[model samples]
Target: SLEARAALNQALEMKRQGKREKAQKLFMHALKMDPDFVDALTEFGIFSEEDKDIIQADYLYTRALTISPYHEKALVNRDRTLPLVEEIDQRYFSIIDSKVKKVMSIPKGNSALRRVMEETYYHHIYHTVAIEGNTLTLSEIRHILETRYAVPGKSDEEQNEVIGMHAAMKYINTTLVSRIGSVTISDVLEIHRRVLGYVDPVEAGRFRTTQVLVGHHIPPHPQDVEKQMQEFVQWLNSEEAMNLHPVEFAALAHYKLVYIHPFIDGNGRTSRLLMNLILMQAGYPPITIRKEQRSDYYHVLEAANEGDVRPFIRFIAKCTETTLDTLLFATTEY
Candidate 1:
């Protein structure tokens, strides 16, 4: 214990001074000096997580668990790491970059901007809700949103969902949507309050008090939602997240929020709204993972849950690029 403390404390000092890789060595050497040092193992495992080497972290934390099952910090780290099971192939980076670069140089807030925005917004509402089995078609949604006319066969809840999304979109386009800084729980709650206000106002913007399972992928217990969300807020504002391309960052946010499934009824709608909020703030038009690709969308998420997120990343990247392509074709006077 005394022997491990020298290396461990020195490593901690190095980490405090921002000597990351050097600190990693001292952290590892602390364990080398005392393999049974529980503190060293836990610290190293945590750094491994910061490195996104979650699989490595799992092993070390698992070791700490077997050695001392009461280790609270290690237990919490393991819980957070297990749920993120996602990976992207290196080859997709250049392709994703080229696609983003093309979109980045395009027209923004131009004369035709609102037309593109309205059409894109319409499709966002159509597909985002439809993924959850909302029965209104794009034709029906246009009639309802454009003329305040409801579809003949639609239930009030369906109509409300369309209206709710319209309200959410209007909020994002006009306010609180941002580029720099974390989005607080308040931001998420307010968006949900706007979204499900029509469907379930009593529980709208409220976190689920019970556990939830969506399809075969189960989210954390209700007790864990705020803890996870706190970390998400921090991560969103962290330099590491800022280093990621805005499109990929938005796509990852969509994946994480949906995986969290924070709210009971309107999680999908809120997640997509936040995705577009980021996209719009970054000066790119929003996206539509069209309902026709619903099966593929589900498949990609399932693939992510099972550990290969390349397909999901590619799908979001392609959808993002395609949105700009459609906008360019329609708006360019050339």
Candidate 2:
């Protein structure tokens, strides 16, 4: 048993070193050696989330929470990771009126920015409702995207692929929050995979393994890429880095993810998905990034890319305020 425990520790160390599969087998072996060990059970759950095993993660975490309700880390992890199950029930029904009111207040206009904002809101509601029912399919996503954008030659198959990508992104949202502290460079790669999983499985969970860029701009050399990513990850996990509002943090993450350009494609969509993921995790509704506002979005992001966060933060704050007003207004009507 002691040897098994030692091996478990070694496995955890290996996990820290980005050897997730190896660490998993070791954790399983350790659990077999001493099934009663609560620590092993808890750590195994953490590992499951790290590996993106959502169902396994949910079960293990629930078990651990039941065994020790006051276990602070377990409690925090459970609350943070699977919050929609617990926290959503507390706030969901009460927020509809405000959301509706905000929607109604927006002027009907044919301007490109207005159209983008309207469609963003439409999809926000559509996807939110779909996720609540666990019925958001690839076909549904494609239909929404194509119908809204009128993309040329877009088919149901293509729309399905896009929705699948969004699904993977949703999975990554939960996985990242659950395992943020212990995530590695390899873990980021896994996140990238999930973000683009439905659209590109071969590239999922793998590094560009090739050159990439931001729009027409070529990214830094491969050798320098890993170190740059490490820097961003370090900031993400750092509690002391710079205290910021939750919405601002979401904006910061969005800007950072894009600047990293870690994926060969889907970086923009993934970053936006990640932004909303962070926002929802921080006890706020997701803000829509209007597709029509792409120019403004890119402009602000470019400023952020050059090391100024003020513009992006302001932009996100405005969106957050609008979202809050919409939800509050809608909820009050009920």
Candidate 3:
């Protein structure tokens, strides 16, 4: 510990003298001597930050905080750079948005496009259900849908969930697609009805008559559900919402519905379908939030609940970009 402290001091002095190269080595030596030296880690993190290694700086600050949980410098610096790290990935969204426009302008009716759309629909149902903790595999989902029969080993509830999702998705792709106007509250209710009818016939399509909890967020009181939904639909079709980039509008639709938590059982699935409905109507393919991206999806929704919706919108844009890239790949000749 004493040797580590001496090395850290010398490193700080070297840094003060603008000897960055020597200071970096001294900082590393300090860390090598005492791996849990919070001071050295924080100092090295600061040095890494000054050298423009944002991720490394974040990692070092995290490591220092692990050793000394209340290290003020580490905490402050970590918070400051966290967005910088996140932006490093999210900055590509502009490029992705441009590609989306390009893909939207491409002529439809490519023969291969039809098959890919069908395939993506199944994968979408598989993932959406899986995100809700359904136990069916993708293959099992295909088996259940294609045969209209339950899989042998899965529970009735699990099979029913998949069935309900398939019905809801079918409604979106067929009935909703051909309709000529903005999405209405009735459309949302009907979607919820299909999503949960088989599982909870009594509650299906009905707004909650009681308050409910979703993680840390509590939905509106039972009496407020109707009024809130009315306002939500009003805002949904209003010029303010409609004028947003389609991806932003869709993402907000998903957030608003889930925030309302209208139905007791099917809110998550219904919100996602509604999000995709907006996307499809706007000439974008339905984007799936893969089971693998479940945590990221939840994180952005959490971010929305905390009063910043931009991250969630960008997250949806990223998903839309992925779908657009896939569509282009499938329709393009190699």
Candidate 4:
């Protein structure tokens, strides 16, 4: 829409005026309104990264590739950053096993959580820029949440979507207690709603009262929908379930959310958003699934709904591990 183009131009102006933070926020809003807005995506990538944010820079650049692989700016930025990342990785592992390993082992006494929180939040911002193609500052995030959580007359759908993402990230990174694979289903839903709240507040914390499915697949009926969603949620919360790896849990949570189709709208966006929420809760970095990967992503997700999660699991695991490698590398260098 012309509105999106206009927003992009205004954001670009802010960037030119040396208002990096403001420009980023507007670009984010523009992309949220229209994910396919290429101008916002390309320029946002250019402004969102610094030399220290190499991994984030790479993620955003890759996202731009998804939207426009031949984009000159994205191609240039990505090529320029790859070698720096490799150099950081080399230095990181050289000392991580010796210096960081000890800190990780101590658990309670160590500052691993704090370190992860700081790193995760930075990456979160990067992922937000990559996915939404805008730079939303912490203060902007807070404002978004405050407006959405207010009374009905005070907030609207857009405000809610922004708040939902903010709240989901906060709960996953700050509220949830982690103990390997011991996460609860309620915890998952709470986080999911918070993330989806920005787009579907009334249905945010509640399971769907009707049947829902992805693509063109029709659900049985309203009652059956409620039944299956209940059962799924119950099983997720159970302790006797299989001992899934953390990344595996993230994959399952993502699939299950999509399968249930709990909300009337925003299902895909919310599901992907919660995928990162689960990853963050597990002390892993956020994964940015590029729009270009949409085809493969949907195929894997289709397999998952048919009771097969291996592809999805492996896909998320690879991204998680890659993000970890990047973070470990960055910590040492940056």
Candidate 5:
């Protein structure tokens, strides 16, 4: 309509000149004029963005998107701030959220709970390391962790990596317990450090100084890794994440790490550990992707790389549910 379009131009001009209030009023007028003006909502969102009012912008952009899912401006504006906005849309994420909530809330105020947590930690270490081609059986890894004794059959490097991972998990647990809210870039680097601490001491604590490849996904150039990671860290600590569920935020972090492939090796282990840490902070049980599900894990991640979050998020959620059900059933039978 002439009325809405005219109002939008006026709003954009005002918004451009730092007249946020005037721009907001004009945008509101445009919405009233057409009632269903896609441009108006988007313009208002821009206006809100101009004044650093992302909450308002989120609502405006979301409304515009709801009215027209393919509205390019609305889609860009809505997803610009929140890295996972588009991925968060798939119904699978919502289902994941619901199941995780139920699992997190199913508490155990008992004595054997400590043993269950220890068991949970074992599952993460054993399976995650196995996924990276560590040939240690679950029993050997369990004894190694339980006794801190070296397993002679496995290569020394592999044995050390497992030890490093256990230390990494402890560091993560302590850090998460001591601090709340979001994680830092240093925290991320530290995990990579601990995971490869003994195995690759040269590159353990540092971001790669050169580019790398992951099957078909070529990671960002080394020059770009630092900048993009800073952006990622900022996003992690951004209000946009505060608006997202804890698991979603964690999963988003995992994708960024894996997609970036910031290290020489151990990216997969680091990604899963990082994701589980975020969930642990949110009071959810840690997730472990078993070796039997390795193919599915790779497939879902490929889907994630292709811009669909449902497969990966659903996979992790099922893992969480499985862990919790086992924890619950063991502690208190049906």
Candidate 6:
């Protein structure tokens, strides 16, 4: 451990000094010392990218990830290069497909299921709300959810956002889950209501009456919003859409809603909730998109706006896989 650590440290110093050849030697030494050293694998992957060896880079990062699946840089780099690696891309989704089957075979009503879900509930609220510019930290959000009270010094709006998300998630899990049938526009409106009722009562539970522009991408005109939403609902429940893999279905559901941009506010939140509703209904656990990935999140959505929704779907698939991993991880510990 000490030798590998020192080698990696020296490699990093060599990298900092613009000594690429020396750094490569040191990095190689470190990996030779400890093949499973995650940081060394990740750093060496970065070094490989510098030399334009994308396959090598992907290999190194993916190796690191196998040793430590949650290594952030390794995950990011591997995903970034995944599209170009046909074998790895297939392997990634294939792994998710098998995991989905594994998770479904988990017997229902396990005690661990409830406990893990309860724990994820708090984190879901924190990340979902924080993505929309809510200033409350995770702890503050937890406090708000626990007590249903405003945090001292926090704005009423921020607190309400948290409260509203909690209520909306409750609605999705408890109320929406119990209902049987395709989701309707009315169901979406109600979900939107719970999301923004405390934050914007005037706009809550209703479609926008005026044209809305989101970051230079103009959604359908106000008159077209309802029609588009209706068509969306039809497609959402259609045999074709439903027949797609559940992850793809859920991702398209989300991307289409946000494209319509139905609400004046809370469109992202509402769409995300709608996404999870579909996922949970399909027997997958609800997934959360971290605020840290907000940039990639929006960027992929923009790619969808540019007429390719595949990237956006892939993004959501990764998020789903993460949630599934979390669920399997928590449940297996018992």
Q: Estimated TM-score per prediction?
A: 0.70, 0.52, 0.70, 0.50, 0.70, 0.71
Please give, for residues 237-308, the per-residue lDDT of candidate 6 as tens digits.
899997787788889999999999999999999999999998888877789999899999989988999988
| Local distance difference test, candidate 6 | 0.88
Model 5 lDDT tens row, 41-116: 8877876786799999999877877775567666677668566645554555566566656655655655566677
Q: How would you order the candidates by lDDT, starting with the best?
A: 6, 3, 1, 5, 2, 4
In model 6, the clashing pairs are none
Q: Which digits, one per residue and each the tens of the lDDT, describe model 3 over residues 1-334?
A: 8999999999999999999999999999999999999889998999999999999999888887766556766778888998996787456656776777877776666667777878888888988999979878888989999999777878998898888998998888889976987778899999999999988989988998986789878789989999999999999889999787778788888999999998989899999999988888877778988888988988998889989987898788778878878878875542
Q: What is the C-alpha lDDT of each candidate?
A: 0.80, 0.63, 0.86, 0.62, 0.79, 0.88
Per-residue lDDT for 269 in model 4? 60
Model 4, span 232-303: residue lDDT tens: 666656764346555666678777767767666555665666677555554445666653456677788777
Model 3 root-mean-square deviation:
13.5
Q: Which ten residues in a row have the lowest lDDT in candidate 6?
A: 82-91
Better of 2 and 6 by TM-score: 6
Clashing residue pairs in candidate 1 (N, C-alpha, C atoms within 3 angstroms): none
In model 4, the Cα lDDT at residue 16 comes to: 80
- Of 3 and 4, the candidate ahead on TM-score is 3
Q: How far does residue 283 in candidate 1 sit from its true spot (Å)?
A: 1.9
Pick the TM-score winner: 6
Once fitted onto the true fold, the runs of candidate 5 whose alpha carbons sit more than 4 angstroms away are 1-109, 332-334
